[PDB]
Design a protein around this ligand. Structure first.
Ligand SMILES: Nc1nc2c(ncn2[C@@H]2O[C@@H]3COP(=O)(O)O[C@H]4[C@@H](O)[C@H](n5cnc6c(=O)[nH]c(N)nc65)O[C@@H]4COP(=O)(O)O[C@H]3[C@H]2O)c(=O)[nH]1
Ligand SMILES: Nc1nc2c(ncn2[C@@H]2O[C@@H]3COP(=O)(O)O[C@H]4[C@@H](O)[C@H](n5cnc6c(=O)[nH]c(N)nc65)O[C@@H]4COP(=O)(O)O[C@H]3[C@H]2O)c(=O)[nH]1
Ligand SMILES: Nc1nc2c(ncn2[C@@H]2O[C@@H]3COP(=O)(O)O[C@H]4[C@@H](O)[C@H](n5cnc6c(=O)[nH]c(N)nc65)O[C@@H]4COP(=O)(O)O[C@H]3[C@H]2O)c(=O)[nH]1
Ligand SMILES: Nc1nc2c(ncn2[C@@H]2O[C@@H]3COP(=O)(O)O[C@H]4[C@@H](O)[C@H](n5cnc6c(=O)[nH]c(N)nc65)O[C@@H]4COP(=O)(O)O[C@H]3[C@H]2O)c(=O)[nH]1
Lengths: 75, 72
């Protein structure tokens, strides 16, 4: 399963919920110099680190991102 | 030193030296379905994967990769 984020839906999720995801995605973009600004695919191991940053299980985290329509239901 | 590979350069490299790396390249491109240019950039840690498959030190591998013109 692929992990693809919607950069445009993400930007409008309030910081209180999405702040740490937004900052994480920004550090990847800066490192990449990847500023397409529509979509961002991350490594499957980036999910474990986000889950730690969010303090949830990778599983709980995924379902939340999907619930926001940021992460394609494919994952 | 970032691993940006010139696939067009490496093709012209004789098979008994370029082979493993050509075949490694091709596996990565198949993993990503990345078939849109003559350049392949790979992970810095892949250097070790490669030094293992070639059974040479990273140092060695990296320096003949530059003579070959495959790397910058
Ligand atoms: N800028 C960007 N676009 C994304 C991202 N995720 C998905 N896409 C879009 O979705 C397709 C597949 O992305 P992919 O799984 O990364 O799979 C990609 C990726 O593996 C690779 N690829 C394409 N361009 C580049 C590149 O500039 N650098 C690297 N390192 N790989 C690339 O080729 C595969 C197919 O690329 P395409 O089908 O032509 O086009 C893309 C691209 O239009 C992302 O994080 N950033
Ligand atoms: N060792 C190695 N393995 C490789 C390489 N390229 C691809 N793979 C493997 O193939 C999977 C799919 O690559 P992808 O479609 O480009 O899909 C990639 C891709 O769109 C993007 N991605 C991950 N890392 C990078 C990166 O450093 N740069 C860019 N531009 N995109 C990345 O995140 C997606 C998921 O990444 P993964 O879960 O890791 O899943 C990756 C990874 O297991 C490589 O150069 N070296
Ligand atoms: N996961 C993913 N990431 C993407 C995709 N398209 C672009 N990117 C990201 O966006 C950066 C800039 O892409 P670019 O300058 O348009 O243009 C790229 C591209 O023209 C070319 N390039 C270098 N390496 C590769 C490669 O392995 N595959 C491909 N298809 N192009 C590459 O050099 C420039 C910089 O390459 P990068 O260092 O890889 O840096 C890429 C990469 O991090 C994509 O479809 N999927
Ligand atoms: N399509 C595709 N290309 C891949 C993948 N892995 C590596 N690459 C390519 O190989 C490059 C160097 O990978 P790196 O040493 O891991 O160096 C990477 C890595 O340290 C980091 N980075 C980029 N994207 C991601 C990511 O999604 N997750 C993580 N944890 N680190 C990333 O920033 C670096 C520079 O990224 P780039 O400019 O994009 O340059 C990337 C990219 O062109 C992959 O799974 N799929």
């Amino acid at each position: 399963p692929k992990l693809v984020l919607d950069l445009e839906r993400l930007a409008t999720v309030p910081a209180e919920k999405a702040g740490p995801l937004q900052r994480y995605a920004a550090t990847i973009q800066s490192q990449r110099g990847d500023y397409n600004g529509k979509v961002l695919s991350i490594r499957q191991d980036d999910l474990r680190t986000l889950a730690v940053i969010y303090d949830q299980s990778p599983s709980v985290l995924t379902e939340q991102l999907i619930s926001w329509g940021v992460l394609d239901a494919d994952a």
